[model samples]
Target: MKTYALVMAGGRGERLWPLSREDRPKPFLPLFEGKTLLEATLERLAPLVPPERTLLAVRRDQEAVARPYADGIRLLLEPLGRDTAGAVLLGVAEALKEGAERLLVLPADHYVGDDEAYREALATMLEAAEEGFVVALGLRPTRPETEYGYIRLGPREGAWYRGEGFVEKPSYAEALEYIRKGYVWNGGVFAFAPATMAELFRRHLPSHHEALERLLAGASLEEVYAGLPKISIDYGVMEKAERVRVVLGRFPWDDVGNWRALERVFSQDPHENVVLGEGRHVALDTFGCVVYADRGVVATLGVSGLVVAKVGDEVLVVPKDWAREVREVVKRLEA
Candidate 1:
């Protein structure tokens, strides 16, 4: 079976604002070990899919910026932002047209520590997909994290487990309860047979299915995207599919969703501060903070639980407790 891999790189990274802008975004930012998050994603999956077989789906406006990362691989440019549901359908359409039978879709900005384990999980998910199952990785939750969605596993059949249902981002107590009852974080890494996914789309998301059909028939992509529903694939199909299966993924993974997420993925100094840039970052008596400075000097004294970031003419300072709310900054700009 020819496995077609797709990296979904369309997010604007609103939570990590000031640094993550409209033209530059988080996936393209230098977040990992001397490489951008998008580059890291491609390198991690190199064993499963070569550069020749891999594909990238990005927004039409950001194509020029994102094209540099894909290099020789195909780039599917979306006319507008229609969320993951539309993104997956677009990738699936591309795979089908290219005669690729098995499809693997993953986010572009996630960090994975164990490459071997990641490849093993992908192999297992591919096996399930070959068996006509819509498979995804149910990541082993290292903590009772209230920020991530949970997956309740059902009857196990060898390497695959039936996906019972999904749990939305829960409270701390609820997250602990879920852990006690045996739950996994929804990793968003997906694999499927092209025909199997096509049927699922036709069942749960007929509007998207029809839209894609018309687009493939030479319709305007912008017009179709304008009328598409803005929703995630997990909500549109996975939770409602009867053939969904989950494979246990033990590889260390993190999406680095917000500034606070930096503490979990990167190393901290003796003072317990995660600093992205040096010399420009001078923190005295600053404990438990994530400081990122792309331009100018970012100095902090006698402060804790704060995210101090600067990019060009913009500077953002917010308590780590409300770091995710930094998206509000973008909303204010839109207003």
Candidate 2:
């Protein structure tokens, strides 16, 4: 099977506010060590797939911004953000045209600490994809994580696990229950055969299939995007498909959805604080906090579990517990 990888890179990352803005999304920002998240993702797939076969799916507006990171790979410019279903369709349409049979779709900003384990998992998923199943890499739940969706495994057949169903983020107690039941966390990594994926689209989303065909057959971006429904692939396909499967991924994976995620991705200082800026940071009894200041000095006194970041003319200060509320803050800013 000729395999291709489609990296989804159109997220605004509002939870990572100040540092991640609309013009400069999270995937492009220099978040990890020195390389941007996009670079890290591309590098992760380099050993598995050649640069010529790698593809990046980004919003049409971000074409120019994402071009530099292309690194000789192809780019799928979406007219607008129509969620993962549209992105998946776009990828299938383009990848099939390029003579690709197997496709691996991944989020661009996720951090995979272990490259070898990740590659092995992808290889296993690819084998399942070759057998015409829409496979997803399910991370074994190390903690009762309420932020990610859960996958109910029916039975294990060799390296592949039959995906019975998908469960949305549950309550704290419910999350623990899911873990106790041996469910895995859906990390948004998917593998599929182009032909199988096309059949799934035709079966589940005929209207979207027709619209996507129109978009592929010389339709206007505005018209095509307007006609497409805003839906995600998990809800639109995998959740409703019988050919869905999951491969256990033992790699260290983190979606890095909010500011607090930095503490896990990056090493902290002696005070257990994450300071991310060129400016000086002075922390007095501040542990378990993330502080970033791009303009001036940032000093925190006797504070814990706080997220303080300053970028451009904006400053954000909130408790780590309210990390998810940053999106609401961005909505307010837009309003």
Candidate 3:
């Protein structure tokens, strides 16, 4: 079956404030060895799916920055941010237009350590998709992370498992219990036949599916998106779909959701600080901090477990434990 890669790159990434801004979101940031997360995702997909068969879904406002990275690939621009379900439907509409038999959907801003294992997982999902199942790549949980969604595994089906249900951001205790029950993290990577996904959307999200039909019929995206419900694919369709399957992903995957994720992605100093931007930061007596300096020198003295990031005229300082609340700072700034 002919397969296409659909990358969702429209996230604002507000939690990583100061560094991830409106103009340059997390996917565009140079997170790994000068390559943006979106670049790394594309590079990883190149081996399994060629660039010509790849599609990028991004917000219309992010066109300028997202364009350079989407070179030689088809760009599906959403007029507004309608969350993952909308983005996925937009990409699905475009992929169907291009006669895609199967589609592999991935978030643009994610860190996968093992490319070989990543590709293997994708191949497995593709094979599962061929068997008429909407396969999701569920990362084997290394820890009981309350920040991520969990996938409950049902009966084992050869190399994959029947997806029982999804639990979104459970409490710490719940996350631990889920892990003990052999639940996996929902990595937001999925594979499905274009028709199968359309059928699920038709059954679970009828209105959204109707909008998709109109979109496929050549209606403008601005018109279609305005009428669509702002819901995530997981909540809208994945949770309701019966033919869903889960494949255990054996690679180290990080969504890099907030500033605290820097400690997981990059190397920490002797003082346990993950400082980036080369020569632009000075951490004296600082421990367990994530400092990112862009454009100017940032010096942190005697601070511990803090995220100090500077980008252009803005700088954000927050405790590592409170890093997820940085979105409030972004909201206040906008207000």
Candidate 4:
């Protein structure tokens, strides 16, 4: 079976601001590593699908932002942002047209420490998909993080596994409870057999499935995906599927969702201050702060929990407590 890959980059990634605008989303942002997050993601799955077989679901306005990537693979423009369900179905339709029978779906922005191990785990999931099972990679959660979605494994079904449904993003106490019961963070990476996904939609979501069928029957991307309900693939399809499989991914993974996450990737001084870009750091009795400035000397003195990411004239200074609010920063940049 030919296994093609889809990178679901349809989300308006605002987690990184100034550096990540609507024109340049988080997936394409250059991190400490020389390559963008999407580049790293593609490299992880390079063993399975080559550039030609890889596909992207992105917005229409970001065409120039993703031009470098589009030079090689096919880029599917969503008329508007719906969610992963529309993103996945659109990709599957395109794959079917290309005679692809299997698909590996991935979020474009995520980080993992061990590349080889992650790739091996990816191979196993793809193999399961080839065997007609819907597969998802579950990451080992290091802490009871409120930022991440959690998954609970259900009683094992024959040739598949049932799900206890997702717990969404839980509070500290709820996360602890989930962890005590041996739950893993939903990795947002899944593999699907074309026939299996089609069947699941037919059973649990017949209306959506019928719409997909009609959409596949020469409907335009805008026509079909325009009015489709906005929902995640897990809530809209995976939970109700009959034959679901889980593989515990053994990679130290992080979604790189906010500035705080950069602390893990970038180096810190003895005072635990992270300095990046062309900024000259002069930390004076500082602990646990991050600074990113491409221009000027950014000095820190007796301060902590400060994040500064500068791109050209746009400079984003956010306190660690409000680091995640960068989502709003990206939105303001759009307006």
TM-scores for all candidates: the values are: 0.92, 0.93, 0.94, 0.90
lDDT of 2 at 182: 90
Model 2 C-alpha lDDT versus the unseen true structure? 0.85
Residue pairs that clash (backbone atoms under 3 angstroms), model 4: none
What CA RMSD would you report for each candidate?
A: 2.1, 2.1, 1.9, 2.8
lDDT of residue 151 for candidate 1? 91
Per-residue lDDT of model 1, residues 114-140, tens digit only: 888988998899888855579988987
Task: Flag the better candidate by lDDT, 1 or 3.
Answer: 3
Q: Give one digit per residue, the lDDT tens place, for model 4 in 295-324.
A: 677677777778877777888778876887
lDDT of 1 at 263: 77
Clash list (residue pairs), candidate 1: none
On lDDT, the stronger of 1 and 4 is 1
Would you list the rank order by TM-score, best first?
3, 2, 1, 4
Q: Model 1: runs farther than 4 Å from truth?
A: 267-271, 333-335
- Report lDDT per candidate: 0.85, 0.85, 0.85, 0.76
TM-score, candidate 4, is 0.90
lDDT of 3 by residue, 1-335 (tens): 68988999867789987778678877888766667899999998899998888889888888999888767788888888889999889778877878988999999899998888999999989988865589998988877789898999999989899999988999999999999998999999999988888988889999788998998788887888998889999999888888789999988888888888888776445347787764377778878888887666899899888898887788889988898899999899889
